[PDB]
Design an enzyme around this catalytic site. Structure first.
Site, PDB file in Angstrom:
ATOM      1  N   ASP B  92     -31.715 -29.320  30.805  1.00 40.30           N
ATOM      2  CA  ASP B  92     -32.963 -28.824  30.242  1.00 40.30           C
ATOM      3  C   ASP B  92     -33.816 -30.006  29.745  1.00 40.30           C
ATOM      4  O   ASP B  92     -33.424 -31.180  29.819  1.00 40.30           O
ATOM      5  CB  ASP B  92     -32.669 -27.787  29.155  1.00 40.30           C
ATOM      6  N   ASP B 269     -28.137 -19.381  32.668  1.00 41.28           N
ATOM      7  CA  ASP B 269     -27.284 -20.173  31.782  1.00 41.28           C
ATOM      8  C   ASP B 269     -27.201 -19.467  30.437  1.00 41.28           C
ATOM      9  O   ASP B 269     -28.157 -18.808  30.019  1.00 41.28           O
ATOM     10  CB  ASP B 269     -27.811 -21.600  31.571  1.00 41.28           C
ATOM     11  N   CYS B 307      -9.681  -8.512  36.039  1.00 33.91           N
ATOM     12  CA  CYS B 307     -10.056  -9.929  36.083  1.00 33.91           C
ATOM     13  C   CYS B 307      -8.974 -10.756  36.777  1.00 33.91           C
ATOM     14  O   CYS B 307      -7.792 -10.644  36.442  1.00 33.91           O
ATOM     15  CB  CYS B 307     -10.269 -10.439  34.653  1.00 33.91           C
ATOM     16  N   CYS B 309      -8.783 -14.076  36.620  1.00 35.83           N
ATOM     17  CA  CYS B 309      -8.672 -15.411  36.036  1.00 35.83           C
ATOM     18  C   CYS B 309      -7.222 -15.762  35.686  1.00 35.83           C
ATOM     19  O   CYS B 309      -6.340 -14.907  35.588  1.00 35.83           O
ATOM     20  CB  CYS B 309      -9.571 -15.567  34.801  1.00 35.83           C
ATOM     21  N   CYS B 312      -5.779 -13.970  32.667  1.00 35.32           N
ATOM     22  CA  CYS B 312      -5.384 -12.576  32.824  1.00 35.32           C
ATOM     23  C   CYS B 312      -4.176 -12.402  33.745  1.00 35.32           C
ATOM     24  O   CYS B 312      -3.521 -11.359  33.679  1.00 35.32           O
ATOM     25  CB  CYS B 312      -6.575 -11.742  33.320  1.00 35.32           C
ATOM     26  N   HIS B 338     -11.236 -17.284  29.978  1.00 32.27           N
ATOM     27  CA  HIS B 338     -11.398 -15.944  30.534  1.00 32.27           C
ATOM     28  C   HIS B 338     -12.874 -15.549  30.597  1.00 32.27           C
ATOM     29  O   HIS B 338     -13.348 -15.009  31.604  1.00 32.27           O
ATOM     30  CB  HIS B 338     -10.630 -14.910  29.707  1.00 32.27           C
TER      31      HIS B 338
HETATM   32 ZN   LIG Z   1      -9.540 -12.972  32.704  1.00 27.82          ZN
END
Ligand SMILES: [Zn+2]
Ligand SMILES: O=S1(=O)C[C@H](O)[C@@H](O)C1
Ligand SMILES: O=S1(=O)C[C@H](O)[C@@H](O)C1
Ligand SMILES: O=S1(=O)C[C@H](O)[C@@H](O)C1
Ligand SMILES: O=S1(=O)C[C@H](O)[C@@H](O)C1
Ligand SMILES: [Zn+2]
Lengths: 375, 375
Positions: B92, B269, B307, B309, B312, B338
Site C-alpha cells: 500500500d 486484503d 476445511c 487446512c 483441521c 486455519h
Molecule cells: Zn482449517
C-alpha cells in the site's frame, strides 16, 4: 531450624513416616527426590517442580563437574542459585557415573577419568568428592564409594565393599574438616555388599562405627530384577541404624518404591518420571500408559482420573496425545510435570497410610490395581 | 514470465476468474492477500502462509517506514528477503495509516507526520511513496492518495478525490521515471469519491486517462455498513476498465468478499483472519465461532468439518480450546493458520464456481449456511 533432625512420627511393620528438618526446609518421609538440572527453558521451571510436592531435589556431581564445573557453579552462587531451587539439595558422589559413563586410572587413592564430552581429565576420591560437593553447596552430601558392576562375583563384591568402607571413613573425615560444611550440611554413608548377606552386615557395621546422618543402600537397581532386590532389602535394611534415614539410590518404578517402603526405605531418587515424560509414557494408578497409542486420540479423560496435578485438572489424554504426536515440547513438559506430581502423590498416600496404620492394605490395593492395567 | 499480465478465464455476470502473471509468480483471481510482517518467531512462518494457498501477500508501507525503515529493508535485500517471501508482494502507499495513526503538515505537496513510536519526522507524497515502495522492492505498487474520513461531506469527498487524481498522475510519472521499477513492477490507481456516483465516475475517468495496471476501489470498509458498501460497488466497479484487475482495499469478512466478487472485484486484503486468530475467533462455513466458548471444551470435531487446512486435519476444537484458554502461543498460531487457509479455500471455491458457471448458486448457498450459524 537445625542442621539435620530426623523424627519418626509413625510406624507400620518396617515402614516409617516422618520428617527430616534441615536449615533450608523440611523433607517429608518417605520422600521422592526428582533429579534436577540447570534452570533453563529446556527443563521444567523450579516453581513447577516445587508445586508438584517435591521437598528436595538431587544433583549429579559427575555431570555438574563436566559442565559447567563446580568452580563455575560456586562462582554463580552455588547449586541453589544454579538450579533456581532454594530448598534442600542432595548430591550424589560422582562415583557411579565414573564407572558407567567415563577412566584413566583407578586405585585405593581415587580415580582419574576423561570427560565423555571434551576429553578433559578429572579426578575423584573421598576427599575430592566431598570438596566438590562443598563447592556445589549441597545440603545432603554422599560419601564416595566404589561400585561393583552387575552381576558381581563374591570376590569382587567383597573387595569393592571393603574399599568403599575405607573410603567411607575418608569421606567422613573430609566432611568434618570443613567447618562451614560440617555445621550446615549432612553426610550419608553407603552400604555395599551386592547380594551377599555377610558382606552387607560387614558394611553396615563399618558404617555405623564411623557414624553418618543417614544410610543409603547401594548396589541395587542395576539389572537384578525386583524379586532379588526385595530379598536383599529384606535382610539389608534391618542392619542399618533404625533412628536414621534409609536411602535406596536410583529406585525406581512406583511398585519398586511401595515394596521398598514395606522394607524400611525412607528416601528415593529416579530419572524415570522425567525420562518417561520425554518419551510419551505417563504413570497412572492403573499402570503406565503410552500416550501415543491410538486409543487415546479421542479420550477426553485426564492422564489419570484420580491425579490431583495441575496437568490432570486441565488437559485430556486426547490433547496431550495430539501435542506429543506433533512433537510439540509442551507435550513432553506436561507429561513430565504429571509424572513427577504422580510420584509425589504416591509418596503422600504412602505417608498418610502409614500414619493411619493401613499401609499394608494400601500396598496390596495398589499392586492389584497397578498390575491389572485397567487404564 | 512477463512483468504483469491479467487474463480472464471465465465470467459469470460481473464476476470474473483468471490469473495475474508476474515475474515472481502467478496470482489466481479472485485473490485474497494476507497482510505480511517480518519473518520472526512471533508470526506464522512464510512457508506456512504459502501452504495455506496464498499467492501474494501485502506489506504496509507506513509501518515498514517507521520500523525498521525502508532504507534498512533495502540494505537487507528488500521486502522479499525481510519477509522470507519470494513470491509477489503488494505494498500500500502509506497514506491511509497517515490519516488514521500518525501529522505535522498537509498540503497539495504531500504530508509530514510524526512516528507514533518515537516521534521522528517522516514525509510522504506521490513521489516519496513510489520511491519508498521501490526501496521495499515490491511487485505491485499503490499510488499515493488522500483519504477522506467517514462519513464525508460531498465537499470534502470531492476535494479529496480531485487531489487524489492529481496525485495519481504524479504517482504514475514517479513510477515511470525509474526504469528498474517500471520494467519489473506494476502500478495500481485508486478510485475515490465516497458514496457519490458522479464523483466515482469523475475518478474512474481520470484514472483510465492516466492508465494503470490495475484499479482499486478506495474509501470503503470505513464504517459504512455492508449494504451501503454494496450499493457503491454496484455503480463504481463498472466504471473501471474491464480488462484490468479490480482491487477492494481492506475487505473483509467472508460474506463481504462473496458479495464484492458478485460485483466485479478481483482482489482483497484484510487483517481479519490474523486478528481473529489471535483473539480466539475462527471462521467456518457456518459462521465465526469463539473457541473459548464452553461448548467446545469436549468438541472433538475440527474447527470446521469441511476445511482442508493442516490444522483441521489434526487438531480438534477441544484441543485448540485448551491451548487458547491456557494462553499458549501455539493456540493462536493454529487458529491464525486455519483462518488464513479458510480464506484461501473460500477464494478457491469462488474461482471454481465462476469457472463452472455456478457462482450465483454458490453465493446463495454460502449466505444461507454462513448466516444460519449451525456450527
Ligand atoms: Zn482449517
Ligand atoms: O528440578 S528443578 O527444580 C527443574 C530444573 O531441573 C531446575 O530448575 C531444578
Ligand atoms: O568441578 S570442577 O570445577 C571440574 C574439574 O573436575 C575441577 O576443576 C573441579
Ligand atoms: O505473511 S508472511 O508469509 C508470514 C510472516 O508475516 C512473514 O514471513 C511474511
Ligand atoms: O523508510 S525510511 O527509511 C524512514 C524515513 O521515512 C526515511 O528515511 C525513509
Ligand atoms: Zn496428573
Amino acid at each position: 531450624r537445625p542442621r539435620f533432625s530426623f523424627s519418626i512420627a509413625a510406624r507400620e511393620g518396617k515402614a516409617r513416616t516422618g520428617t527430616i528438618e534441615m536449615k533450608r526446609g523440611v523433607i517429608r518421609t518417605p520422600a521422592f527426590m526428582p533429579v534436577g538440572t540447570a534452570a533453563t527453558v529446556k527443563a521444567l521451571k523450579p516453581e513447577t517442580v516445587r508445586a508438584t510436592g517435591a521437598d528436595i531435589i538431587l544433583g549429579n556431581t559427575y555431570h555438574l563437574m563436566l559442565r559447567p564445573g563446580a568452580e563455575r557453579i560456586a562462582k554463580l552462587g552455588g547449586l541453589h542459585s544454579f538450579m533456581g531451587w532454594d530448598r534442600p539439595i542432595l548430591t550424589d558422589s560422582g562415583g557411579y557415573q565414573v564407572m558407567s559413563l567415563s577412566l584413566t586410572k583407578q586405585s585405593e587413592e581415587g580415580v582419574t577419568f576423561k570427560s565423555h564430552l571434551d576429553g578433559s581429565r578429572h579426578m575423584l576420591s573421598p576427599e575430592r568428592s566431598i570438596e566438590i560437593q562443598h563447592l556445589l553447596g549441597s545440603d545432603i552430601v554422599m560419601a564416595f564409594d566404589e561400585s561393583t558392576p552387575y552381576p558381581a562375583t563374591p570376590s569382587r563384591a567383597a573387595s569393592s565393599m571393603e574399599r568403599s568402607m575405607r573410603w567411607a571413613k575418608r569421606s567422613r573425615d573430609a566432611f568434618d574438616s570443613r567447618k562451614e560444611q560440617a555445621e550446615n550440611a549432612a553426610l550419608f554413608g553407603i552400604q555395599q555388599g551386592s547380594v551377599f548377606e555377610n558382606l552387607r552386615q560387614q558394611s553396615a557395621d563399618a558404617l555405623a562405627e564411623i557414624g553418618f546422618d543417614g544410610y543409603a543402600v547401594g548396589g541395587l537397581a542395576v539389572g537384578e530384577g525386583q524379586d532379588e532386590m526385595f530379598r536383599v532389602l529384606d535382610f539389608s535394611v534391618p542392619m542399618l541404624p533404625d533412628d536414621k534415614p534409609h536411602y535406596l539410590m536410583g529406585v525406581g518404578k512406583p511398585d519398586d518404591i511401595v515394596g521398598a517402603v514395606e522394607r524400611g526405605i525412607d528416601m528415593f531418587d529416579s530419572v524415570l518420571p522425567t525420562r518417561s515424560g520425554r518419551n510419551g509414557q505417563a504413570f497412572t494408578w492403573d499402570g503406565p500408559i503410552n500416550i501415543r497409542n491410538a486409543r487415546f486420540s479421542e479420550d477426553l479423560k485426564p492422564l489419570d482420573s484420580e491425579c490431583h496435578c495441575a496437568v490432570c485438572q486441565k488437559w485430556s489424554r486426547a490433547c496431550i496425545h495430539a501435542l506429543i504426536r506433533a512433537g510439540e515440547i509442551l507435550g513432553a513438559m506436561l507429561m513430565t510435570e504429571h509424572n513427577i506430581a504422580f510420584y509425589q502423590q504416591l509418596m503422600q498416600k504412602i505417608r498418610d497410610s502409614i500414619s493411619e496404620g493401613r499401609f499394608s492394605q494400601f500396598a496390596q490395593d495398589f499392586r492389584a490395581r497397578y498390575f491389572a492395567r485397567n487404564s
